[PDB]
Design a protein around this nucleic acid. Structure first.
Ligand SMILES: [Zn+2]
Ligand SMILES: [Zn+2]
Lengths: 76, 87, 148, 83, 109, 93, 99, 94, 108, 82, 99
DNA sequence: ATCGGATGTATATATCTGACACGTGCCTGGAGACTAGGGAGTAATCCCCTTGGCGGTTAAAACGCGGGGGACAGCGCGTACGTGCGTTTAAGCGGTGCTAGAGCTGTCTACGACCAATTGAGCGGCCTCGGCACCGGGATTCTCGAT
DNA sequence: ATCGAGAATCCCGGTGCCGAGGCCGCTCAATTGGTCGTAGACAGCTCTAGCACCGCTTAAACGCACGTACGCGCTGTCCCCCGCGTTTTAACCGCCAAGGGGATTACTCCCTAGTCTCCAGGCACGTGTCAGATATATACATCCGAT
């Protein structure tokens, strides 16, 4: 698929994942394409905090979805 | 002190200008009155070179109105009058 | 005003004596805005790394400290991804006596060795502390990704 | 609209009457200069506190409430003027 | 009690109890206010007011007047031993002072 | 306009209860209001501090009783404690 | 031939008369003017309610009466009917007002 | 182990190191300093609360603390304390 | 100031700010507490502590000691004027009193 | 039961206290008055402390209670807590 | 023939020594017994922490030192060097402790 | 020892006026019923520390005595304050003009309360070494009887 | 004016000890991010009274003269704290032993803040009237030079 992620800096990033793909593969793709450490991300889908236990198939992400990223980081 | 002052030492350590109404800190550091009168509210209330608090001395001298040094002011204005008059 | 004249003396001072691996110049017409370059020291994991940073001066100088920002991206425990710099002299012991040359050389000195006591980024600092080779290789790949 | 040499308004008979209420039988001649200074100091303190209280509240007229509050703060609690 | 009349009359008092409870709650003294505290406070206030009023009334009757002016209040407060200690720092407006003269200053025989 | 509450009617009722054939002027009435407010503030402050001291978050009756015992002198404190206990006992039933 | 009192009796009579009265003893206008002069130093163009001036006058009178009582006691302690400035200074110092 | 007990030891020690780098301090002086800090804090906060209740307001802004410091401390100390507080407020917000 | 750093460091103080804010809120002084009050209060407290500590250290150095003991605190508090007026009522434990002998008692 | 402990404050102790105060010559009647005033002060402070202990449902006094009892009277004490 | 100091010239030495010291001036056990009896008057079978007794002793010492300072000042005001009880009553009356 | 002015204070009676006591409209704050959840009462258990006690040992308290300095009583003085009266001054009281500013009201926007995840500042327990306390010796300095 | 001997105090060096500053582990409270009812900032209007002015009293203040009593200094006398020496007493330190009660956790239940609805108690306002202040005229306590 194609998922658009909007960050607090207004950076446009498009990810190509699958509904059956686990969160680990998605995080690996994020690491490959961005290099940002994994511990700094907890994503929000429809106001629900993402948990690595459930896969993408449970969420059933619609096509062309906007994804928001917020998580506390010490140091600013 | 230093009855024959050089022009270079008369430079204020902060604003790089001839001293105007010098104020002598207990650390024997001299600088112009505007610099101290500003740094007492918008700096850490410590000597910029020595880095130690001078709150008690300033508090005592403020009420006594003994901040200025008449001797150094007079020697500076007589030795270098043309820098003082342009201010 | 007085800040402008102080900037004039300081620019003359930096012109007459250039610090090693350091150059400063006004990119904008306004004298408050500045740009500078940092060159990786030889005795450092970074080799052949040159970076550009911007300097913003407040209305009153040197009563208030300047603000330094890293336009380029550097992987360091004490520097965030955005480019903000966490330095003790910048905020804690800023004094009117200190000058831009001194703060830049202090930034270079801290760039030489991270300080784990006050970690800007905790995970990077701790992974730096655990093993040298991991931080070395991640810094190498990051600096070839960005610096060169 | 300046005010000068007005502390002398506290006349000698007034201080004599106050001492007479206090229970004084024979008053010296140097009392009438110490009493004015003492009164000026006390009034200075109370007026400073009252002016601070009316300065905080963004008002340009002091009130009996401010004076009562200042006196209560200083330890000289006052009754019969509000509170 | 019968839990039928008003709260002030339920405790056999004259001072209000609802007002005391409201002042305790909204006077930011504590997070929570007990049910029995306002009754106790109202009773104490009423009893103190009763003593001051009766002493002032006696001092006024001894003066041959039917109204209690601040002078009577000052006399009642200063004359009583315990109330003087309780109200040592209070300054009553237009109260005057107790009449006394040191024995040394009396005329010599 | 605005409404300015006071302790007027209650003090007048107490005065009539004690001396049935006397009266009180306005100045003495204001003096009584100020005195009542002063005593109330003293007792409330002492009770609040006592409640805060023992890591408590409520003001029961015993806190007011202890504040009364602390503030007032001997005989006054004993009489006030007795009066308050009687009032609360008659109130609770 | 003219009749005059012995020095001292008039003072006792004034004491006895004044300890019975309860009005004020300082003239209103001079005290109001003094209060205005003191106040205008701390802040300019202030305005005063009448009740505030009356409260200040009452407090000042009570404080001065107390101070004079203590001064008279100090004077009588040292075997002196007359009061002197040293008595006022001692009373204020012991009360802790000057410290 | 016993429950934690809050105290101002670390901050007093840090300020002392900032003033006199080579000077130590004893434990009884620490107790005295902790008691003094608690006393000043209670005085200032109580005065500010009372003054905010006087003007019929529910919040304690910086203005109330400024006026409380202006009232409690002597004038010469009050001026410096007000200046320091104004610094802290104006530097924290930016 | 910049975000995502400790408030005490943002304001430049040494005394804690979060602790002061918590004490203000949970100490039963008002229903609501402003966001700027704790910074001001902690700044005032730190200034007073720094002043008294500096005076005590000066006294201790004058006494040829390297550790401040309550006697040094007593001397610093009483010798100064404004601090003495502020702390007129408080009693320092094991602090002693200032050396003062009236001129009359001295021999002639 | 304990009694007649007010004599424990010996004459030399009061003499030393007065010497610290700054007196040069002491009359022979000071000691009884000093004992009386000290007893009155102790009675007041101890009564306040005992009431504070009573309110806390405890059967032993604590230095904290004495510190607050002294603070209430207007005589603050440092170095013991608070 | 044996050396003897003048009457009153060692009181000054004692003053100079004691105003320099900071130790307690009252023996621990007698004061502790006095506190215990005064306490057991109010309530039977109390238990005192050591710090409580220490705080009580410190408060009493400070109060007595202040009272003696004021008494000495009163005595010097009365043109004397000795201190007598009437000075103590005068100091207490002025301070408002007894009134 | 009082005697008779001479004074000031206390007491008896008309009167009239403005503040006090009381009646009234009403509206805002107090009273009544139901809910729920967090605070407070109660029980069991740990172990800190406070009371009780015996032996040594010794600094501090008690008693006695000589005497020098200070508290206190009596006398003399001259000067500063009390008392009284004529005169100059400004408080005091009434009446009027006005406007600066206290005080109440309607909007709404931005500051602060609330809640869950989280981890790093801060507290409890250990440990060691240097600054402080104690002791021995000598140098320095008030002090007093006699010149 | 001073010399010098006896006694107290201050310096300096050496030795020993214990608590203060640093370190490590850990549990909990401050940070952060977002959401939402509301506090007060602001603009606008009303109408209270604080300020300023005027003119007519007469009450308090002022200055001067006179007389006296008392604050102050001086002198003399007695007695009582002070300094020192000698002796008796219990404070102080160390040590041991016990158990009472402070302090903690776990549990349960019920007290009260919160919400809504309804109604009468006190507040601002207006009115009648008598308590006390004012004036006037007697009667008695008290002070003062002198018998
Ligand atoms: Zn300069
Ligand atoms: Zn310096």
């Amino acid at each position: 698929m194609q998922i658009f992620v909007k960050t607090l800096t207004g950076k446009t990033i498009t990810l190509e994942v699958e509904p059956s793909d686990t969160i680990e593969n998605v995080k690996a793709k994020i690491q490959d394409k961005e290099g940002i450490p994994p511990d700094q991300q907890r994503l929000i889908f429809a106001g629900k905090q993402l948990e690595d236990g459930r896969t993408l198939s449970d969420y059933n992400i619609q096509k062309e979805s906007t994804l928001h990223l917020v998580l506390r980081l010490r140091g600013g | 002190k230093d009855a024959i002052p050089s022009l270079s030492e008369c430079q204020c350590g902060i604003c790089m200008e001839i001293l105007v109404e010098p104020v002598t800190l207990p650390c024997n550091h001299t600088l112009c009155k505007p610099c101290f009168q500003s740094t007492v509210e918008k700096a850490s209330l410590c000597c910029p070179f020595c880095r130690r608090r001078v709150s008690s001395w300033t508090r005592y001298h403020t009420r006594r109105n003994s901040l200025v040094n008449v001797e150094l002011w007079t020697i500076i204005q007589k030795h270098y009058p043309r820098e003082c008059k342009l201010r | 005003h007085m800040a402008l004249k102080r900037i004039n003396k300081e620019l003359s001072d930096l012109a007459r004596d250039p610090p090693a691996q350091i150059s400063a110049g006004p990119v904008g017409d306004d004298m408050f805005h500045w740009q500078a370059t940092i060159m990786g020291p030889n005795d450092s994991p970074y080799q052949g790394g040159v970076f550009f940073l911007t300097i913003h001066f407040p209305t009153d100088y040197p009563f208030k400290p300047p603000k330094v920002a890293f336009t380029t991206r550097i992987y360091h425990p004490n520097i965030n991804s955005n480019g903000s710099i966490c330095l003790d002299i910048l905020r804690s012991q800023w004094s009117p006596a200190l000058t831009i040359s001194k703060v830049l050389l202090s930034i270079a000195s801290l760039l030489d060795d991270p300080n784990p006591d006050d970690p800007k980024v905790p995970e990077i600092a701790r992974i730096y502390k655990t093993d040298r080779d991991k931080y070395n290789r991640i810094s190498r790949e990051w600096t070839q990704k960005y610096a060169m | 609209k300046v005010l000068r040499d007005n502390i002398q308004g506290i006349t000698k008979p007034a201080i004599r009457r106050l001492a007479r209420r206090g229970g004084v039988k024979r008053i010296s001649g140097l009392i009438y200069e110490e009493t004015r200074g003492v009164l000026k100091v006390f009034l200075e303190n109370v007026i400073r506190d009252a002016v601070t209280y009316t300065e905080h509240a963004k008002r340009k007229t002091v009130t009996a409430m401010d004076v009562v509050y200042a006196l209560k703060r200083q330890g000289r609690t006052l009754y019969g003027f509000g509170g | 009690s019968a839990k039928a009349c008003t709260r002030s009359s339920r405790a056999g008092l004259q001072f209000p109890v609802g007002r005391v409870h409201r002042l305790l709650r909204k006077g930011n003294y504590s997070e929570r206010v007990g049910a029995g505290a306002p009754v106790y406070l109202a009773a104490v206030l009423e009893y103190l007011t009763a003593e001051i009023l009766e002493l002032a009334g006696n001092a006024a009757r001894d003066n041959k007047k039917t109204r209690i002016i601040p002078r009577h209040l000052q006399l009642a407060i200063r004359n009583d031993e315990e109330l003087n200690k309780l109200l040592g720092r209070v300054t009553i407006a237009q109260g005057g002072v107790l009449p006394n003269i040191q024995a040394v200053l009396l005329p010599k025989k | 306009r605005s409404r300015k509450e006071s302790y007027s009617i209650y003090v007048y009722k107490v005065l009539k209860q004690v001396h049935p054939d006397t009266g009180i002027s306005s100045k003495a009435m204001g003096i009584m209001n100020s005195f009542v407010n002063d005593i109330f503030e003293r007792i409330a402050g002492e009770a609040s501090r006592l409640a805060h001291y023992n890591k408590r978050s409520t003001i029961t009756s015993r806190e007011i009783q202890t504040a009364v015992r602390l503030l007032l002198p001997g005989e006054l404190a004993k009489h006030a404690v007795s009066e308050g206990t009687k009032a609360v006992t008659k109130y609770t039933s | 031939k003219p009749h005059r009192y012995r020095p001292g009796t008039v003072a006792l009579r004034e004491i006895r008369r004044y300890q019975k009265s309860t009005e004020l003893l300082i003239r209103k206008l001079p005290f109001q003017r003094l209060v205005r002069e003191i106040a205008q130093d701390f802040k300019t163009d202030l305005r005063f309610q009448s009740s505030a001036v009356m409260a200040l006058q009452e407090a000042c009178e009570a404080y001065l009466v107390g101070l004079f009582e203590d001064t008279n006691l100090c004077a009588i302690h040292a075997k002196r009917v007359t009061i002197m400035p040293k008595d006022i200074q001692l009373a204020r110092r012991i009360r802790g007002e000057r410290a």
